[PDB]
Amino acid sequence: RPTFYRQELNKTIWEVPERYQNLSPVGSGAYGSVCAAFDTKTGHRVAVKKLSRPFQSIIHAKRTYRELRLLKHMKHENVIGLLDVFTPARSLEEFNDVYLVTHLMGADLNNIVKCQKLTDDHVQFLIYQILRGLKYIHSADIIHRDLKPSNLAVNEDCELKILDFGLARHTDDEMTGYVATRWYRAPEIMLNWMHYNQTVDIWSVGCIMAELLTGRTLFPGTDHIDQLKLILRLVGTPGAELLKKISSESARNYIQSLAQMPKMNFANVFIGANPLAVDLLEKMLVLDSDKRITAAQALAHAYFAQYHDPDDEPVADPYDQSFESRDLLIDEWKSLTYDEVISFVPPP
Ligand SMILES: CCNC(=O)N1CCN(C(C)=O)CC1
Ligand SMILES: [Cl-]
Ligand SMILES: [Cl-]
Ligand SMILES: [Cl-]
């Protein structure tokens, strides 16, 4: 056991191992109660997150367990990993607090799309890295569910990591009106058309790739219905085959009230873009999720010829998510979480 010291951060007593020095908050609330520190064991600048009320309800205790299981599993160059996890508790009986430690990068995609000039070469390398990380994530049967520029970290050398996995978090108010929290979501999840699957993340990659090419949001809807009208004007209204797959009768009925529209010519929307970039956008932004290109198929597209290496695009170890259908009490979820804290092995 390391020695711990106490200090007042975010109006609360933080108790951390001596290895973590010069703590000071970061993200101004956007990431939670997360501080920047210097890790004297590794020499890295790190983010230390103190969970708030991790065991306050069955729902919160299971969310705590889900987040720690996911972060312990993810071991890939283009995905956030877990550097450390700790508790000052010396037994299960006094266990109350959980602290997560990750690497910290300098910026997010929002801070390079807004204020920088991107070559086609920059767009190739950024989208290549998102798809390499998604091949890995999807191989474990994990759905991200919330890819958008603020969830993509990027350094001075244009190297990218995926963070902030959807932990089933987002509220109705958070998705309402003129908000970036909804602009990257696939239509089948935005309007609850059907049971969704990993194809929702490829719709999001299309929206991000389009914004890197034009500097403008692809579908900046003012509400759910305005956004659907923007989507259907580009990709066309649904045909009888997709309408059959919308399990919600009322959602099917609303779609059929709209005048039919053909798919637009993407060369006339993305004026001057690399023809290979136009071709790949046409394969991602497909209304029927069954017919979208997958991450593994997209890596072999000619747009990425410069970067693609089929011997260096790794898949994940198997991930057991059977806990997601399990019904347990608060103290059972808390005991499962304690065992995952004490069994953690740091990376090389
Ligand atoms: C835009 C740069 N920010 C980051 O690199 N991340 C790393 C992961 N982290 C937490 C809570 O562990 C928050 C922020
Ligand atoms: Cl220490
Ligand atoms: Cl990492
Ligand atoms: Cl504790």
Ligand SMILES: [Cl-]
């Ligand atoms: Cl964003």
Ligand SMILES: [Cl-]
């Ligand atoms: Cl597992």
Ligand SMILES: [Mg+2]
């Ligand atoms: Mg985020």
